Amino acid sequence: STGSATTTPIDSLDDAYITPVQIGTPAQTLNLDFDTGSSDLWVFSSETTASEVDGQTIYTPSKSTTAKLLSGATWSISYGDGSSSSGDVYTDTVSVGGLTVTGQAVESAKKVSSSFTEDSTIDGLLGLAFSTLNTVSPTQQKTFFDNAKASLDSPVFTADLGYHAPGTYNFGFIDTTAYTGSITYTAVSTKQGFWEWTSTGYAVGSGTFKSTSIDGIADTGTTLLYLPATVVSAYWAQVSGAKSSSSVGGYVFPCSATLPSFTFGVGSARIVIPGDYIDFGPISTGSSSCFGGIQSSAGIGINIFGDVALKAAFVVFNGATTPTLGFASK
Numbered sequence: 340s341t342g343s344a345t346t347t348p349i350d351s352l353d354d355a356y357i358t359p360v361q362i363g364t365p366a367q368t369l370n371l372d373f374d375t376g377s378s379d380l381w382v383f384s385s386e387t388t389a390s391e392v393d394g395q396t397i398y399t400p401s402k403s404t405t406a407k408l409l410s411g412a413t414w415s416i417s418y419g420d421g422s423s424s425s426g427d428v429y430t431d432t433v434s435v436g437g438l439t440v441t442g443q444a445v446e447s448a449k450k451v452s453s454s455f456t457e458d459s460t461i462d463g464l465l466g467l468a469f470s471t472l473n474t475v476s477p478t479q480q481k482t483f484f485d486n487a488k489a490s491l492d493s494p495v496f497t498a499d500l501g502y503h504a505p506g507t508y509n510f511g512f513i514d515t516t517a518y519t520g521s522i523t524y525t526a527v528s529t530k531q532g533f534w535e536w537t538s539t540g541y542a543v544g545s546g547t548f549k550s551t552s553i554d555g556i557a558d559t560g561t562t563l564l565y566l567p568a569t570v571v572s573a574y575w576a577q578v579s580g581a582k583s584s585s586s587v588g589g590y591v592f593p594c595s596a597t598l599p600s601f602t603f604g605v606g607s608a609r610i611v612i613p614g615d616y617i618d619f620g621p622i623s624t625g626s627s628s629c630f631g632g633i634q635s636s637a638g639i640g641i642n643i644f645g646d647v648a649l650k651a652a653f654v655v656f657n658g659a660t661t662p663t664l665g666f667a668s669k
Contacts (some may be wrong), residue, residue, distance in 0.1 A: 340490045341511035342358050342438025346500065347375065349460040352619055353646060354562050356500060357460060358508055361434040362445055363403030369462035373508055374560030375498070375656065376643070378472035378482050378622060379425055381446035382421070382431070382463035383455075384556050391451050394459030400447065406431045414446045414474045419561070419639060424451040433483060435465075437544035438510050440487050444473075464560070467496065468501035471649055472532035472637055484510070484658060494658045498559055502616055504629075512548065518653035518667035523608035526660045533558070534656060536664050538644075539606060541566075543574050544599030548609070556643030557649060557656070557664055563619070564601070565636035565643040572632050574601055581631070587622050591632040594621060603648060605666040612651045614623070 346356040357370035362382070369382055383392060385399040400406035406429045406591050417426035426449035433443040446461070446534030455461065465471070470481045499517050500506040507517070513565045530537045533556040540550040553566065571590065575581040581592035592598070598614030617632035632647040655665030 340438055340487070340505055341433075341492055341509070342436035342487075342509060343509045344436030346504050346508055347505045347607060348501065349458070353500075353503060354649065355458075355461060356506070356559070357462075357645070358435070358465070360465060360626050362398055363400070363431050364373065364405040365403075366434070367396075367398055367403065369398060370460065371463050371465040372461050372560060373467055373498075374558070375464045375467040376556060376560045377416065377418065377464065377530065378466040378468045378470055379414060379442065379446050379474055380463070380465045381414065381426070381448055382417070383495065383612075384426070384447040384452070386426060387448045392455045393456050396462045398445065398463075399438035399443075400429045400431065403409055403431055405441075406445075407476075409444060409475075412444075412475050412478060412480075414476070416474045419643075420454070422452045422454040424448045424455060428480070430563060435483065435510065436493075436508065438487055440483055440665070443483055443486055444475060446475065468534065469529050469532045471529070482588050484656075487511075488658055496656050496658070497652045498656065500646055502613075505555050506650070516668045517592065520668055521652070522655055522665040522667040523605045524655070524657070524663045524665045525605055527664055529662060530584070533641075534662070534664055539604030541570055541604065542602040543577050545642055547579075548604070549603065550604070553603075553642055555636075557654060558643050558645050559649060561643045561645030562647070563643075563646065564617075564633045564647040565639055566633065567642065568635045571633055571635045574599070575631065583635075585623065587628070587630070589634040591622060591628045592631055594627045594629040596629075603644070609665065609668055610648070610652045610668060612648060616651060631667045
């Protein structure tokens with residue numbers, strides 16, 4: 340089997356991407372944030388505290404003839420940005436782009452933090468990291484990809500995120516028309532539950548490539564590119580007037596600037612992020628200070644190849660017995 344679904348930016352900055360997902364019988368379509376940095380499929384629901392719902396579409400398990408309470412199971416998750424959610428669990432039929440999994444754990448939110456409430460466009464998350472990170476207790480649950488894997492023509496999914504445009508998540512096949520050149524594959528460590536890999540270096544603009552190992556995670560659920568402070572300083576030093584602002588929470592730059600590209604290494608291959616992809620616009624409406632798309636990971640504990648980096652590539656998440664990641668230009 341295969342599946343193919345379009346993923347769409349939630350706003351004009353590509354702050355996140357939403358993909359329609361069919362849950363239950365008859366189908367209830369929710370727009371979920373596909374997150375290769377986490378492993379829970381959770382949704383706004385008829386159980387979510389009413390004051391914490393503000394425009395989201397909700398899953399109502401009582402209206403699904405295939406929903407079943409997963410008795411005794413609870414979940415609770417906290418993300419790297421400080422947001423969180425928790426609740427109980429149903430199993431139900433879940434379909435993405437024509438690919439159907441029966442008995443998928445659908446984590447129904449009883450509580451969500453303010454950042455979720457305030458984002459009316461995101462009806463929940465669909466985790467695509469390794470199932471060892473799934474938070475359901477006392478019986479940990481499998482991701483949608485893990486459940487679908489055996490049925491797929493090939494045990495893979497691909498992320499093809501657009502810059503200020505829709506893109507595609509495919510399951511079970513690699514669309515050879517969606518990229519240019521060849522795909523370069525690189526080793527993955529699953530030790531922390533992430534799609535963790537080691538970039539071979541970077542360049543700023545037209546500068547020379549610096550060969551250096553940068554361990555990090557491929558994370559579709561993180562907006563920006565978070566890298567070591569040395570690398571990030573070298574980038575922003577090429578932008579007149581750019582500075583790190585403690586009051587804003589990262590590097591800002593004059594909105595009048597033209598940003599240089601940023602290149603990252605994948606083995607001997609190179610993925611070029613155009614400068615425009617690194618512009619996240621005014622820090623507040625009407626400001627002439629703009630927020631940068633490359634930020635320091637120093638306070639995170641891990642480097643994160645988020646959407647800024649991934650959207651410059653066609654990315655293969657290879658879930659074979661020994662997982663690997665593939666990157667191609669496009």
